[PDB]
Design a protein around this ligand. Structure first.
Ligand SMILES: *[C@@H]1O[C@H](CO)[C@@H](O)[C@H](O)[C@H]1NC(C)=O
Ligand SMILES: *[C@@H]1O[C@H](CO)[C@@H](O)[C@H](O)[C@H]1NC(C)=O
Lengths: 50, 101, 111, 101, 129, 50
């Protein structure tokens, strides 16, 4: 904004605060909703059991 | 960790493998692609992979002597049992955990 | 930033009665039906532990006798049946702006 | 013999190909013994007998890793053969073979 | 079990660096932000600094800006606080705290931090000749 | 016998049910031989050779 007495940038507070809240909930849901237990995906087999 | 040993060589106690420091417990087993110190005396280890899979994770591990070598064979000798399949410092030597009869 | 004041300071009551301390913030802290305030309590020789978070809930392990409420800029901490082992210092803390500010603090002690 | 395992191993005699400059052959076996159980070894020859056995209690099941990587002290929750992973994010592209959460 | 222990403090004349380390264990450290907070003797608490989970973005208060340097090593679960350009007012009792908002994102200089879950045992730093 | 396969084989002398006009069943056996090995068939009877 610019007027007869001053100028400069003035960031809005509430809208982008709510935006940060929803984005952090979004990334939390994307990352943490995948739960994983202990496992051993490495298996070994011999020649007679291809 | 095994180093030059594999699972078969440590469970059977190879001459090159007695130097490892056993632990009370371990999570998994480390091998190396250069590990060929397994079955000294040539043969087939039946259910080998099953032994490898069962022995992966333990919480208490105590090696003990079921039959003492010096007392459990009054009618048999056990000092003549050696093999040239794999030597310990150039001398014929069988596994630490087994005894030729 | 934001500054707050706890009007009762170093108030003294005996065991069993009610102790009320308020907390007035310079500007509004609550947003979208949520209270952004926490209370802290420290004993001599101990780090300040959390007592009530979000101004209504309770940290597990805190006795049920500790309760608090409030909305907008005014919040209250209430003690139901003060015990002699609860002589300590209470704090306000708005976690709404990047400079979280603690209150000047109040003391509760025997009469 | 035991409470669940029982097998008679008849020795066989034959001329085998030379492996580790030794003509003979030897099949190794293993079995589990429950607490309060009995294992039996009855033979008249061609039997290698245990000297040291091992005791354990198995903790679920883990895997075996083959690699050429040194070992140091850590507190990790994923273990590829070629390192470890933060596991703070749900997708990794280090190695298909992993152990842990 | 969450644990926060810190050490390295003591007495220091003005004008020499001092470094503090708050090791953490028993919880997922790399997914939470950490804070610095201090207790001036005879006064109340006041905020010092904050670092986010990835360590990219850091912030400081209006009293120690340009003099402190908050840092973090997730490989050792160790929080660090480089601390330079001392004065007599800086004497206080330093605590390391954990934020409550899991994996919180801090992108600007006014956002809403979480409340402090758990605190360190406290180490003494003082400024005297 | 070889560097990998080693097992003795025993005859199966018995009167099987008639099938394909024939009484008796013979079992066939297959094994790899890795390069630089030696497979050493040796028998005094009942050996269907390769
Ligand atoms: C009004 O605020 C502006 C910025 O928007 C500032 O430049 C000015 O000094 C203020 N004027 C009055 C009369 O309050
Ligand atoms: C161990 O393995 C190495 C591999 O280079 C081999 O040369 C050596 O003969 C083996 N030793 C024993 C005792 O099995």
């Amino acid at each position: 904004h610019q007027n007869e007495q001053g100028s400069g940038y003035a960031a809005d507070l509430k809208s982008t605060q709510n935006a940060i809240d929803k984005i952090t909930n979004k990334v939390n849901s994307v990352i943490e909703k995948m739960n994983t237990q202990f496992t051993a995906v490495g298996k070994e087999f011999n020649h007679l059991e291809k | 960790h095994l180093g030059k040993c594999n699972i078969a060589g440590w469970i059977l106690g190879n001459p090159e493998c007695e130097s490892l420091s056993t632990a009370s417990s371990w999570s998994y087993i480390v091998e190396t692609p250069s590990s060929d110190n397994g079955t000294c005396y040539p043969g087939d280890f039946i259910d080998y992979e099953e032994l490898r899979e069962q022995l992966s994770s333990v919480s208490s591990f105590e090696r003990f002597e079921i039959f003492p070598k010096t007392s459990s064979w009054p009618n048999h000798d056990s000092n003549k049992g050696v093999t040239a399949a794999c030597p310990h410092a150039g001398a014929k030597s069988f596994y630490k955990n087994l005894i030729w009869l | 930033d934001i500054v707050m004041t706890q009007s009762p300071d170093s108030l003294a009551v005996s065991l069993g009665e009610r102790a009320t301390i308020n907390c007035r913030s310079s500007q509004s802290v609550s947003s979208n039906n949520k209270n952004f305030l926490a209370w802290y309590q420290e004993k001599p020789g101990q780090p300040p532990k959390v007592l009530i978070y979000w101004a209504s809930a309770r940290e597990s392990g805190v006795p049920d006798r500790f309760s608090g409420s409030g909305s907008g800029t005014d919040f209250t901490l209430t003690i139901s049946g003060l015990q002699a082992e609860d002589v300590a210092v209470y704090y306000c803390q708005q976690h709404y702006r990047t400079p979280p500010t603690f209150g000047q603090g109040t003391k509760v002690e025997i009469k | 013999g035991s409470s669940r395992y029982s097998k008679k191993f008849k020795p066989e005699i034959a001329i085998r190909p030379k492996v580790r400059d030794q003509e003979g052959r030897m099949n190794y076996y293993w079995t589990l013994v429950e607490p309060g159980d009995k294992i039996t070894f009855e033979a008249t020859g061609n039997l290698v007998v245990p000297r040291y056995a091992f005791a354990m209690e198995r903790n679920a099941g883990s895997g075996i890793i083959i690699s050429d990587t040194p070992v140091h002290d850590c507190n990790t929750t994923c273990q590829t053969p070629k390192g470890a992973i933060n596991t703070s994010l749900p997708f990794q592209n280090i190695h298909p073979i992993t152990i842990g959460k | 079990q969450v644990q926060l222990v810190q050490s390295g403090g003591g007495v220091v004349p003005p004008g020499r660096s001092l470094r503090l380390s708050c090791a953490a264990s028993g919880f997922t450290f790399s997914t939470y932000g950490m804070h610095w907070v201090r207790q001036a003797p005879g006064k109340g608490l006041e905020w010092v600094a904050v670092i986010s989970y990835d360590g990219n973005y850091k912030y400081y208060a209006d009293s120690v800006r340009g003099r402190f340097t908050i840092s973090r090593d997730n490989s050792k679960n160790t929080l660090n606080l480089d601390m330079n350009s001392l004065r007599t007012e800086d004497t206080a009792l330093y605590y390391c705290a954990k934020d409550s908002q899991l994996r919180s994102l801090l992108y600007f200089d006014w956002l809403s931090q979480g409340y402090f879950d758990h605190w360190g045992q406290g180490t003494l730093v003082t400024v005297s000749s």
